[PDB]
Design a protein around this nucleic acid. Structure first.
Ligand SMILES: [Cl-]
Ligand SMILES: [Cl-]
Ligand SMILES: [Cl-]
Ligand SMILES: [Cl-]
Ligand SMILES: [K+]
Ligand SMILES: [Mg+2]
Ligand SMILES: [Mg+2]
Ligand SMILES: [Mg+2]
Ligand SMILES: [Mg+2]
Ligand SMILES: [Mg+2]
Ligand SMILES: [Mg+2]
Ligand SMILES: [Mg+2]
Ligand SMILES: [Mg+2]
Ligand SMILES: [Mg+2]
Ligand SMILES: [Mg+2]
Ligand SMILES: [Mg+2]
Ligand SMILES: [Mg+2]
Ligand SMILES: [Mg+2]
Ligand SMILES: [Mg+2]
Ligand SMILES: [Mg+2]
Ligand SMILES: [Mg+2]
Ligand SMILES: [Mg+2]
Ligand code: NA
Ligand code: NA
Ligand code: NA
Ligand code: NA
Ligand code: NA
Ligand code: NA
Ligand code: NA
Ligand code: NA
Ligand SMILES: [Sr+2]
Ligand SMILES: [Sr+2]
Ligand SMILES: [Sr+2]
Ligand SMILES: [Sr+2]
Ligand SMILES: [Sr+2]
Ligand SMILES: [Sr+2]
Ligand SMILES: [Sr+2]
Ligand SMILES: [Sr+2]
Ligand SMILES: [Sr+2]
Ligand SMILES: [Sr+2]
Ligand SMILES: [Sr+2]
Ligand SMILES: [Sr+2]
Ligand SMILES: [Sr+2]
Ligand SMILES: [Sr+2]
Ligand SMILES: [Sr+2]
Ligand SMILES: [Sr+2]
Lengths: 56, 194, 237, 92
RNA sequence: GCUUUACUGCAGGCUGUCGCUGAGGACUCUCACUCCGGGAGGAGGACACCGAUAGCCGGGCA
RNA sequence: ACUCGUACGGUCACUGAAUCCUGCCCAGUGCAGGUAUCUGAACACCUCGUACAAGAGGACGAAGGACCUGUCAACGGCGGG
RNA sequence: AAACAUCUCAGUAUCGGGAGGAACAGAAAACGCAAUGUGAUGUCGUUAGUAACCGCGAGUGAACGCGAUACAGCCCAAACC
């Protein structure tokens, strides 16, 4: 079976959902962790300096 | 005449001799069975505490903290490094154990502020320090002419920023002249070369 | 290279774990204050997934129902005893000190009160040899003379299920089924059959370890493969 | 080659010709207190140590004469250029 | 990326030493510490574990 | 983690059902054991040096090596005259 | 660094923790234009690519002082009660 088109038909699982905390569709309903704001992982908000250019 | 305090002090100049030696041999047995941070009603070294600002009053807390002895507990580089940055064993951290101790204590008592700390011995695998913490919200302290300074907003979490006595020493701020070119006014402002 | 299989094991991931949630019970001797007035009745014989051997369910006087490491020759109804005074018959447990020399024993404790450490496998047994006030000498299944505290408890007789090893698996499917009941990754791919990146013996046009197999005791994990600190090899001499 | 142990030649000290005694230069022992010694300790630690991780170079097939020339009257010695010599044995 | 008796290092293991650590080139003891025991208590014991350092091995890794 | 496991165990490897078989080689390399003697670091100790210190040398000497032994279903070898 | 290991890029990127409107520093166990001299601390200009470091290679790199800005000095522990 090819890893492309034929394997795309098996995709009917729900993982990322609208997050209660930030509103983004990034709350992983299985991990119960938001990949966007960090909800479920940390009280503090998910942030990183690499989200922008170094001198900016 | 000599103060009673001086005797406590004089005993602690040689914690390995005399009565104190036997007291430590006994105590450490109990201490080893205590937690990482144990609050205590009275300083083990009264003279030192009072000398550092301690007072028998409301809002003054003292806690003993133990920390693992030795150098750093570092993980080897998982990515490529030049011989220089491959070291793992003989590398030590930049904060002394007393500082690590003051911080753990302050975490245990979120509302309190570290005033000062001092050593109370160690065995072959750990070190103990007692920490004096102050309740900046208690009126008995907001009114003390000798401690109300620690109530100011900018004194919040002072220990986490190196404002402690052990903090300042460890930052190379002792000397006022030669040798402090890169420590004063801050390590960060000097590019971190101190 | 990449970590070898022996190193993947240590992480204790599912692939390398034992089906513990499926295991029946810990077969440690009962704990008695003293007196030996402890007796129970074998209420049933069961199969132990973890050892491929039978185990006996016993109901004790004080109302304690517990599985026991059963020796050969124990059946429902039979009464067992556990204590310093316990009778000297197959299936009973008592400290070595009370056991008569020359008597095959099983489920021997390493340290008095641990519940049993030695001789617990199918059809095996330790042999109590010497008595004393300071040391009970036992001969373990491997043929080793072990000096133990006479206060160490044990069970008279040999472990049930002897001979299990005398019949061959004949087919892979049988190994398969047994392996699925153990904390073991099976089947086994030879080192020599892997790529250089996966094992010290990998690589090369034809298969062959490109090095001697006897490895030093001081070898680090990842390199300690083949014949570990062998005192010798082969069948000769 | 052969070499006289003593002979008349110019002593740059007396500023005149006098008998001299020739001797092979014996290596002087180190103290371990020179600056280079302190730099080795200062600059050697974890990993490679730059120059202090290098090791003794090679050897030339033949070495040059390494001799001391001692004046027979003032007792002082002087050095001269050397010349390649497989062997140097003194006569007497 | 891979290999090795390439160069240089780094983990890791073995080993000595110092601290933990006590009493009377081999020895006894118990009180720290360790382990077994539900507990009493038992086993071991200044060793071992751990911190530091030194020598050896060291494509397991860079 | 193995492990509610304990040598009829389980870990590490090689060969690859049954059948008939599996010779010679331990010099080199590997592993392991032993070791009078040799070599073998640091601390402590001793001498010289320094009113101290740096430093030089000595004595002691662990593992290791030299040396000896075991081992090829251990890496491998089994030629020319 | 025309490779590269010390060095460099750099205490930079990035990560953990924490405060404020600014932070940090700060009233000498200082300096050492050695003096019959200066007098808490930042910072700005300069001192200076100087001293110092360095496969003494490539490169790295202060301070005292001086001219400025702004200026401000105090509180405990103990003795005795
Ligand atoms: Cl604080
Ligand atoms: Cl099996
Ligand atoms: Cl010469
Ligand atoms: Cl001045
Ligand atoms: K680099
Ligand atoms: Mg007052
Ligand atoms: Mg600043
Ligand atoms: Mg059991
Ligand atoms: Mg399985
Ligand atoms: Mg296979
Ligand atoms: Mg292949
Ligand atoms: Mg490999
Ligand atoms: Mg083959
Ligand atoms: Mg335990
Ligand atoms: Mg490589
Ligand atoms: Mg094959
Ligand atoms: Mg095949
Ligand atoms: Mg380059
Ligand atoms: Mg640097
Ligand atoms: Mg160059
Ligand atoms: Mg720099
Ligand atoms: Mg200066
Ligand atoms: Na706090
Ligand atoms: Na240096
Ligand atoms: Na590649
Ligand atoms: Na051989
Ligand atoms: Na280049
Ligand atoms: Na290159
Ligand atoms: Na350099
Ligand atoms: Na001037
Ligand atoms: Sr397939
Ligand atoms: Sr298809
Ligand atoms: Sr699906
Ligand atoms: Sr979470
Ligand atoms: Sr962040
Ligand atoms: Sr806070
Ligand atoms: Sr058990
Ligand atoms: Sr148990
Ligand atoms: Sr191979
Ligand atoms: Sr043979
Ligand atoms: Sr250095
Ligand atoms: Sr080095
Ligand atoms: Sr040459
Ligand atoms: Sr066959
Ligand atoms: Sr051999
Ligand atoms: Sr002023």
């Amino acid at each position: 079976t090819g890893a492309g088109t034929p394997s795309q038909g098996k995709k009917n699982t729900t993982t990322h959902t609208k997050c209660r905390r930030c509103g983004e569709k990034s709350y992983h309903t299985k991990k119960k962790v938001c990949s966007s704001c960090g909800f479920g992982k940390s009280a503090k908000r998910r942030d990183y300096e690499w989200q922008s250019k170094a001198g900016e | 005449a000599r103060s009673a305090y001086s005797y406590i002090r004089d005993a602690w100049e040689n914690p390995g001799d005399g009565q104190l030696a036997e007291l430590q041999w006994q105590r450490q047995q109990e201490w080893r069975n205590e937690g990482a941070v144990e609050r205590i009603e009275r300083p083990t070294r009264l003279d030192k505490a009072r000398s550092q600002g301690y007072k028998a009053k409301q809002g003054v807390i003292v806690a003993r903290v133990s920390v693992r002895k030795g150098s750093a507990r570092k993980r080897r580089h998982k990515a490529g490094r030049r011989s220089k940055r491959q070291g793992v064993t003989r590398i030590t951290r930049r904060k002394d154990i007393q500082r690590v101790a003051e911080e753990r204590a302050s975490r245990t008592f979120p509302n309190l502020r570290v005033l000062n700390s001092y050593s109370v011995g160690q065995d072959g695998r750990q070190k103990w320090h007692e920490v004096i913490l102050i309740d900046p919200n208690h009126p008995a302290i907001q009114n003390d002419d000798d401690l109300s300074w620690i109530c100011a907003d900018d004194q919040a979490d002072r220990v986490f920023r190196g404002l402690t006595g052990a903090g300042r020493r460890n930052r190379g701020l002792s000397g006022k002249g030669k040798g402090s070119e890169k420590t004063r006014p801050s390590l960060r402002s000097n590019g971190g070369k101190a | 290279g990449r970590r070898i299989q022996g190193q993947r094991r240590g992480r204790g991931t599912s692939t390398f774990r034992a089906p513990s949630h499926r295991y029946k019970a810990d077969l440690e001797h009962r704990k008695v204050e003293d007196g030996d007035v402890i007796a129970g009745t074998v209420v049933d014989i069961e199969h132990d997934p973890a050892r491929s051997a039978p185990v006996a369910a016993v109901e004790f006087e004080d109302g304690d129902r517990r599985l026991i490491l059963a020796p050969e020759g124990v059946g429902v109804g039979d009464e067992l005893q556990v204590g310093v005074s316990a009778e000297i018959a197959p299936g009973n447990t008592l400290p070595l000190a009370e056991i008569p020399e020359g008597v095959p024993v099983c489920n021997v404790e390493s340290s008095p009160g641990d519940g049993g450490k030695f001789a617990r496998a199918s059809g095996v047994n330790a042999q109590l040899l010497t008595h004393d006030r300071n040391v009970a000498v036992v001969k373990l299944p491997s043929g080793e003379m072990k000096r133990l505290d006479p206060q160490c408890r044990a069970t008279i007789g040999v472990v049930a299920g002897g001979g299990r090893t005398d019949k061959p698996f004949v087919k892979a499917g049988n190994k398969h089924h047994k392996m699925k009941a153990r904390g073991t990754k099976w089947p086994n791919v030879r080192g020599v059959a892997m790529n250089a990146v996966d094992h010290p013996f990998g690589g090369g046009g034809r298969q062959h370890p490109g090095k001697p197999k006897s490895i030093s005791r001081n070898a680090p994990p990842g390199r300690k493969v083949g014949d570990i600190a062998s005192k010798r090899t082969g069948r000769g001499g | 080659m052969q070499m006289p142990r003593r002979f008349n030649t110019y002593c740059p000290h007396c500023n005149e010709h006098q008998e001299h005694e020739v001797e092979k230069v014996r290596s002087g022992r180190q103290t371990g207190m020179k600056w280079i010694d302190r730099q080795r300790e200062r600059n050697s630690g974890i990993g490679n140590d730059g120059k202090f991780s290098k090791v003794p170079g090679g050897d030339k097939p033949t070495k040059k004469t390494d001799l001391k020339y001692r004046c027979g009257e003032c007792g002082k010695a002087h050095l001269r250029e050397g010349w390649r010599a497989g062997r140097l044995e003194f006569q007497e």
